[PDB]
Amino acid sequence: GPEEITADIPNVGEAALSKLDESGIVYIGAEVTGGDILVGKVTPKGETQLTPEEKLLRAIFGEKASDVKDSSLRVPNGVSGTVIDVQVFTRDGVEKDKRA
Amino acid sequence: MNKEILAVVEAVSNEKALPREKIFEALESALATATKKKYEQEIDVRVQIDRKSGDFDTFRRWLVVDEVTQPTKEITLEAARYEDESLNLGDYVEDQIESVTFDRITTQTAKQVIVQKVREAERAMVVDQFREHEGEIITGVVKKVNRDNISLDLGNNAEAVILREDMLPRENFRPGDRVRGVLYSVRPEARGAQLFVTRSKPEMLIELFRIEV
Amino acid sequence: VTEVEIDGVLHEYSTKEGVQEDILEILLNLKGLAVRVQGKDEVILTLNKSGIGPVTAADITHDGDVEIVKPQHVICHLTDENASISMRIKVQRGRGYVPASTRE
Amino acid sequence: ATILAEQLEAFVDPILLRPVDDLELTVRSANCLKAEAIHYIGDLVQRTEVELLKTPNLGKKSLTEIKDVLASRGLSLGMRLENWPPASIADE
């Protein structure tokens, strides 16, 4: 499967996405620190094969064709700033989310 | 009533003889756990098991008592006077509901918690399996070597721990060897039933001679 | 002065429709504001101005103890008939030089 | 220091206290209680659930919303107040 640009991801904290909107991308104007999350991004993990203990998880959660890790963009360690401008470019065919 | 859980109930490769319904509750609270952190407490293992439904909506409880301990699960008869004294002393009358914890996201953490619940169920099953025998003259093969402990691997995915205090002083065992003895631990151990054998007791060689003659 | 909240402005690097200075230049001109307070720790001043021309420092709705000492101080220039700024200013006591990076 | 000092002596329940509209549920669940001129959930806790069920201002879905709110056991627990104030709710 592809990657998820939505905020819906695990291993987070109120400090993990308290500045993000409901669709992963940081606000325009949110004054961030060094090491926060700007874009939340989750990617796929292992495929292998359907295990005996995960046979019920093969198809029982809509988008259960992919796994979930963590590869969100972060401010590189050291720099502050204020997000002034956000661009979102979409390859044609892909579903535009609510912020695009 | 999508009927996905109905056919998901009858998988049923490994949880046929195991409590099916309990595994749905397990997986349902596991879908509800994962990314919950607000609410009031946590979730609720207890949930109206409606076989037909399949996706039993996690319902809460009120537990009628005559006491003031477990605040979100406390009723009295004076509070039952508003229900016209219909409640009796000691009942677990449910008067509340709960929801789910989400999306894209929270569901591989729900996969992860689904796995956690499945693991707990498997531990319970292993405990029941070890209780079936309750200590016998079974053999095994060493696989790992811990500090003052020997790990053994039997059949049907079963592992036993050999204490060094219940072992011989000079006689030292290693991996690849096959030893046989009588276990004496299947009840309270640690997260299930750690098969603890004792190859040094007398009853140990009671059927050892019986195996020969 | 410590904090400014212009109404239609998200971050300090933006631009407001109808004022010929940036929001950053408005912050510098408010940083140079010479103001006396009398019986408080901090205080919140309110500014409302609409119409073509300057927004001087005498257009602040003064409280019962705040006193501007130089009312001819320019902040910005409004430059249209219906284009108006409306800000809240936070003025407090202190000692020395307390920058933004130490202390929203 | 004595010389320099002598040269200067000529100078020197939170759910009950919160409003019904502040609840996480929809505005209809708050308006069902608010139809009886109730603004705080403490007034909802002052009255019994049987007394609210004897009035048709609350609906069937409003009863389910009231049950969902009472599942946290912060409101509608069958309590009795003086009028508004508990001792911790004191006037200062």
The structural domains of chain B, with segments of one domain joined by +, span: 4-128, 129-197
Q: With DSSP H G I counted as helix, E B as strand and the rest as coil, what are the percentages for chain D, rounded to 5?
A: 45, 0, 50
Long-range own/partner contacts, residues B198-207 (CB < 8 A, 24 or more apart):
B198/B163, B198/B166, B199/B162, B199/B166, B199/B167, B199/B168, B200/B166, B200/B167, B200/B168, B201/B166, B204/B137, B206/B137, B207/B137
Q: Cα–Cα distances in Å, from A32 out to A21, A35, A80, C103? A: 14, 8, 6, 14
List A73's β-bridge partners, or say none: A39
**Quick one: angle between helices D60-70 and D27-34, nearest 10?**
100
User: Which pair of tokens denotes residue B207?
Assistant: 């059927």
Which residues of chain A are within 8 Å of residue B8 when distances are taken between CB atoms? Answer: 56, 60
- In angstroms, the separation between the Cα of residue C13 and the nearest Cα of chain A is 7
Residues B15, B23: Cα–Cα separation, whole Å: 8
Q: What is the resolution of this structure in A?
A: 4.6
D40: DSSP letter:
B
What token pair was written down for A92?
Answer: 């044609």
CB contact under 8 Å between C10 and A28, yes or no, is yes
Element containing residue A29 per DSSP (H, E): none
Report d(CA D89, CA B108) in Å as an integer. Answer: 45
Q: Answer for the pair A88, A99: CB distance below 8 angstroms, yes or no.
A: yes
| Three-state secondary structure string covering B3-18 | CHHHHHHCCCCCCCCC
Token output for C55: 């927004």
* Dihedral, CA of residue C60, residue C66, residue C67 and residue C72, to nearest 10: -20
Q: How far is CA D86 from CA B75, D19, D48, D81, D90, in A?
A: 22, 16, 18, 7, 7
Report the distance separating Cα C57 and Cα C35, nearest Å: 10
Contact call for residues C59 and C45 (beta carbons, < 8 A): no
B143, B177 Cβ separation under 8 angstroms: no
How many domains does chain A contain in total? 1
Q: In terms of residue numbers, what domain contains A54?
A: 1-94
Give exposure, C55-71, as e/b (b: 16+ Cβ within 10 Å).
Answer: bbbeebeeeeebebeee
| CA neighbours closer than 13 Å in the CB half-sphere of residue B165 | 1
Query: CB distance from A83 to chain C under 8 Å?
Result: yes
How far, in whole angstroms, is CA C62 from its chain's centroid?
12
Q: Which residues contact B78 (CB under 8 A, 6 or more apart)?
A: D78
CB B72 to CB D77 under 8 A?
A: no
Could B111 and A56 be called an inter-chain contact, meaning their C-beta atoms sit closer than 8 Å?
Answer: no
> Rounded to whole angstroms, how far apart are CA atoms A31 and C25?
19
Query: B92, B95, B94: which is closest to B64 by C-alpha?
Result: B92
C-beta atoms of B14 and A42 within 8 A: no
User: CB of D29 within 8 A of CB of D69?
Assistant: yes
Q: Does B85 touch chain D (CB under 8 A)?
A: no
Q: Do B74 and D73 touch (CB under 8 A)?
A: yes
- The answer to whether B89 and B114 have CB atoms below 8 angstroms apart is no
Q: Any CB–CB contact under 8 A between A28 and chain C?
A: yes
Give me the sign of the Cα torsion angle C7, C13, C17, C21. Answer: positive
> What is the CATH T-level fold of the domain B4-128, as seen in this structure?
N Utilization Substance Protein A; Chain:P; domain 4 (3.30.1480)
Q: Are the C-beta atoms of B148 and B164 separated by less than 8 Å?
A: yes
Encoding tokens for residue A8? 């819906």
Nearest Cα neighbor of B140 from B112, B102, B178 is B178
The subunits that touch chain A, with at least 3 C-beta pairs less than 8 Å apart, are B, C
Contacts of B147 (CB under 8 A, 6+ apart): none
Name the residue range of residue D77's domain. 13-86
How do strand B159-163 and strand B195-198 relate by DSSP bridges?
parallel
Angle between helices B20-33 and B106-133 (to 10 degrees): 150
> B99: which residues sit within 8 A by CB, 6+ positions away?
B32, B57, B58
Residue appearing with tokens 């590869």: A71
Q: Which residues contact B61 (CB under 8 A, 6 or more apart)?
A: B44, B46, B73, B92, B93, B94, B95, B96
Question: Using CA atoms, how far apart are residues B115 and B101, in angstroms rounded to an integer?
Answer: 16
Look up the CATH number of the domain holding residue C54: 2.170.120.12
CATH number at residue A53: 2.40.50.150
The residue to which tokens 């609720």 are assigned: B44
Contact B74 D50 (CB under 8 A): no
In DSSP notation, B52-99 reads TTSS---B----B-SS--STTS-B-TTTTTTTTT---TT------B--
Map tokens 């949110």 to a residue: A30
Max CA pair span of chain D = 88
In this structure, are residues D29 and D66 in contact, taking their beta carbons and an 8 Å threshold? yes
The answer to whether position A100 is within a domain reads: no
Q: Is A99 within the bounds of a domain?
A: no
Query: Top-level CATH class of B129-197?
Result: mainly beta
Give the technique used to solve this structure: cryo-EM
User: Within the 42-71 window of chain D, which residues sit less than 8 Å (CB to CB) from chain B?
Assistant: 48-51, 64, 67-68, 70-71
- Compute the distance between CA of residue D42 and CA of residue D20 in angstroms, rounded to an integer: 9
